[PDB]
Design an enzyme around this catalytic site. Structure first.
Site, PDB file in Angstrom:
ATOM      1  CG  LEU A 124     -52.495 -38.455 -80.496  1.00 18.94           C
ATOM      2  CD1 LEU A 124     -53.176 -39.403 -81.591  1.00 18.94           C
ATOM      3  CD2 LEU A 124     -51.039 -37.995 -81.167  1.00 18.94           C
ATOM      4  N   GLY A 125     -53.418 -34.748 -78.067  1.00 20.47           N
ATOM      5  CA  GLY A 125     -53.746 -33.269 -77.862  1.00 20.47           C
ATOM      6  C   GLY A 125     -54.821 -33.181 -76.560  1.00 20.47           C
ATOM      7  NE  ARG A 126     -52.059 -33.128 -72.944  1.00 19.46           N
ATOM      8  CZ  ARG A 126     -51.226 -32.373 -71.851  1.00 19.46           C
ATOM      9  NH1 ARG A 126     -51.230 -31.033 -71.600  1.00 19.46           N
ATOM     10  NH2 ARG A 126     -50.387 -33.208 -71.314  1.00 19.46           N
ATOM     11  N   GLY A 127     -58.105 -30.624 -75.297  1.00 20.21           N
ATOM     12  CA  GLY A 127     -58.840 -29.594 -75.680  1.00 20.21           C
ATOM     13  C   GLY A 127     -59.766 -29.062 -74.585  1.00 20.21           C
ATOM     14  CE1 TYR A 129     -66.163 -26.693 -73.280  1.00 19.83           C
ATOM     15  CE2 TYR A 129     -66.761 -27.131 -75.332  1.00 19.83           C
ATOM     16  CZ  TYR A 129     -66.451 -26.174 -74.526  1.00 19.83           C
ATOM     17  OH  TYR A 129     -66.904 -24.851 -74.596  1.00 19.83           O
ATOM     18  CD  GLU A 151     -57.911 -35.629 -70.627  1.00 23.67           C
ATOM     19  OE1 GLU A 151     -58.069 -36.958 -70.294  1.00 23.67           O
ATOM     20  OE2 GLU A 151     -57.326 -34.907 -69.822  1.00 23.67           O
ATOM     21  CB  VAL A 152     -57.272 -36.556 -78.783  1.00 27.06           C
ATOM     22  CG1 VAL A 152     -57.460 -37.564 -80.004  1.00 27.06           C
ATOM     23  CG2 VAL A 152     -58.771 -35.912 -78.795  1.00 27.06           C
ATOM     24  CE  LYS A 179     -64.065 -35.202 -78.650  1.00 27.45           C
ATOM     25  NZ  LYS A 179     -64.491 -34.323 -79.977  1.00 27.45           N
ATOM     26  CG  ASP A 222     -64.727 -24.898 -82.841  1.00 22.02           C
ATOM     27  OD1 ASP A 222     -64.542 -23.957 -83.007  1.00 22.02           O
ATOM     28  OD2 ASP A 222     -64.302 -26.019 -82.148  1.00 22.02           O
TER      29      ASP A 222
END
Ligand SMILES: O=C(O)c1ccc2c(c1)nc(NCCCCCCCNCc1ccc(-c3ccccc3)c(Cl)c1)c1ccncc12
EC number: 2.7.11.1
Length: 330
Positions: A43-46, A48, A50-51, A66, A154
């Site tokens: 679903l997405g990469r941040g 700190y 991954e989701v 997560k 944030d």
């Protein structure tokens, strides 16, 4: 040296709470089995984490896992303790489980699955009511977690989940969130550049929930003026300049004098002299519908250098910009 500062609200809540409420480093974690959860899609990469979209196989229910990127044990307990303390709260994402993968023992957080909506068609069917409404919703979460003595730190659009079909909003990623403590001195390398508050820009460390409010002022100024992002810095140092060039250098230096911040010597050359621009400099043919004397008076009451001067979330919700959503709620 600098002047100490204290929040104008919720100042000592965490002091009046049972030690363990905020002493997250002593919090014990009962790590589940990530095999209860089958990954579906990425679903997405941040930075700190991954989701993924996953499925709990004992009700066929739909969750989100997560996987945490390797960090100090410390930061995982912080994020868990905050989630668990905020669980159930208005518009806060719902931590559903805390599990490790048997093989990696890498920790991952299960969340409530929210259907978000494609931000493409989101920015096109966004009405001046829609902004008011959804902004009130973010304040419900912000005022909650602040009353609970926690700063999100944030607050950006990537961290706001909107299920427009149900009008369900969830403030998310609490990996940077922290407990407010009168006197405590906090890191300035938090939040992303376009929403960093002035305190962060000059390395002022005794900030508080006011940080969340600047972020939100940036988010609001982006959408009503149709300018993503609204303060468009090249780098952290130029970000303050992109802010100075709108709020004026006058109030900025006054901010610095009042708190006696050892302003970093670079700055002393790139800022300069700029008036406090009038907001109607930023309204044009394509965005005059979202703009109203109400909207601008609220926006002007959020974007201040003096973190102490900005409204509180609760003070924000009673602003007349929101009179319409309130009535229709009751
Ligand atoms: O780690 C965590 O905690 C965590 C917890 C749960 C989930 C998670 C991370 N990640 C997920 N997947 C990818 C995240 C990126 C998409 C985020 C939409 C972008 N936002 C849209 C908008 C639209 C309008 C406005 C607006 C409204 C009013 C005024 C101004 C602006 C704003 Cl503000 C934002 C996920 C997916 C499904 N279920 C749960 C999660």
């Amino acid at each position: 040296g600098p002047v100490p500062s204290r929040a104008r609200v919720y100042t000592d809540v965490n002091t009046h709470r049972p030690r363990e409420y905020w002493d997250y480093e002593s919090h014990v974690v009962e790590w589940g089995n990530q095999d209860d959860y089958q990954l579906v899609r990425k679903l997405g990469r941040g930075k700190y984490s991954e989701v993924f979209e996953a499925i709990n196989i004992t009700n066929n229910e739909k969750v989100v896992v997560k996987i945490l990127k390797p960090v100090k044990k410390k930061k995982i307990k912080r994020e868990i303790k905050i989630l668990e303390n905020l669980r159930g709260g208005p518009n806060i994402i719902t931590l559903a489980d805390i599990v490790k993968d048997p093989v990696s023992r890498t920790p991952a957080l299960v969340f409530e699955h929210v259907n978000n909506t494609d931000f493409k068609q989101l920015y096109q069917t966004l009405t001046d009511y829609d902004i008011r409404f959804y902004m009130y919703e973010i304040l419900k979460a912000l005022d909650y977690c602040h009353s609970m003595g926690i700063m999100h730190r944030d607050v950006k659009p990537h961290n706001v989940m909107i299920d427009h079909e149900h009008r369900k909003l969830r403030l998310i990623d609490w990996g940077l969130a922290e407990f407010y403590h009168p006197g405590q001195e906090y890191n300035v390398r938090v939040a992303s550049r376009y929403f960093k508050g002035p305190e962060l820009l000059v390395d002022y460390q005794m900030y508080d929930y006011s940080l969340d409010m600047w972020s939100l002022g940036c988010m609001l100024a982006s959408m009503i003026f149709r300018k993503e992002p609204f303060f468009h810095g090249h780098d952290n140092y130029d970000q303050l300049v992109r802010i100075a060039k709108v709020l004026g250098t006058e109030d900025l230096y006054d901010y610095i004098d009042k708190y006696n911040i050892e302003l970093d010597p670079r700055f002393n050359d790139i800022l300069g002299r700029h008036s406090r621009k009038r907001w109607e400099r930023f309204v044009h043919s394509e965005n005059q519908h979202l703009v109203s004397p109400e909207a601008l008076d609220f926006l002007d009451k959020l974007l201040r250098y003096d973190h102490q001067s900005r409204l509180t979330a609760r003070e924000a919700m009673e602003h007349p910009y929101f009179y319409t959503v309130v009535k229709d709620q009751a």
